[PDB]
Amino acid sequence: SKSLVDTVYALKDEVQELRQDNKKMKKSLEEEQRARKDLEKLVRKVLKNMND
């Protein structure tokens, strides 16, 4: 059925673009962890400049 088949492939589309966004979300969540882990280093270097 034309319309029945349409909506499904319309959905395969929508779902594909969703995988896409996870991909990059997973990606920049992971950049954020790294950005802040580096911040702890800096902060820890500070603390071991006071009580040294």
Q: Which residues contact a second copy (rule: CB under 8 A)?
A: 4-5, 7-9, 11-12, 14-15, 18-19, 21-22, 25-26, 28-29, 32-33, 35-36, 39-40, 42-43, 46-47, 49-50
Q: What is the distance between the alpha carbons of residues 33 and 4, in angstroms, rounded to a whole number?
A: 44
Please report how many Cα atoms fall inside a 13 Å half-sphere around the Cα of residue 48, on the Cβ side: 6
The distance of closest approach from Cβ of residue 14 to a second copy in the complex, given in angstroms and rounded to an integer, is 6
For the bound state, the minimum distance from the C-beta of residue 23 to a second copy, rounded and expressed in Å, comes to 10
Cα-to-chain-centroid distance, residue 31: 8
